[PDB]
Design a protein around this nucleic acid. Sequence first.
DNA 1: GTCTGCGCCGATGAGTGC
DNA 2: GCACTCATCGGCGCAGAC
Length: 112
Amino acid sequence: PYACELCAKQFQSPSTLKMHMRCHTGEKPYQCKTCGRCFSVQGNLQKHERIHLGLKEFVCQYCNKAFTLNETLKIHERIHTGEKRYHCQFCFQRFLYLSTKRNHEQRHIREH
DNA sequence: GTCTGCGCCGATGAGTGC
DNA sequence: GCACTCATCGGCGCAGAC
Ligand SMILES: [Zn+2]
Ligand SMILES: [Zn+2]
Ligand SMILES: [Zn+2]
Ligand SMILES: [Zn+2]
């Protein structure tokens, strides 16, 4: 609907195209008031700002370890739930971590 | 050299509400 | 139609264990 003049990717609205163009201009409008690091995406600055607060607000319901970000907590909880979301494309094996799945698939390929 | 665990990013998407 | 918030998910880097 809204196409990028520089790489042909397409977007839904003026605002999402405007956001994508920052990948090409390097514009980073949103500046951390503590350390001065700038971000292209306001939501990414907000994650960063949690680091300076030092409040690890996201707590594991299984072992009670605390984390700075919700996403970091959720990745951690996979250890407890047994969620293995990375599937080998060649066999039944399932993996907790993407890097491990990738190395396992490469072993299939080296065998042909 | 690989597996684990995790800290911190870029960039896109879903949901929401105007 | 539109923008905003937060989720999502890959990438990367690293340290400890083996
Ligand atoms: Zn582009
Ligand atoms: Zn900062
Ligand atoms: Zn836990
Ligand atoms: Zn396999």
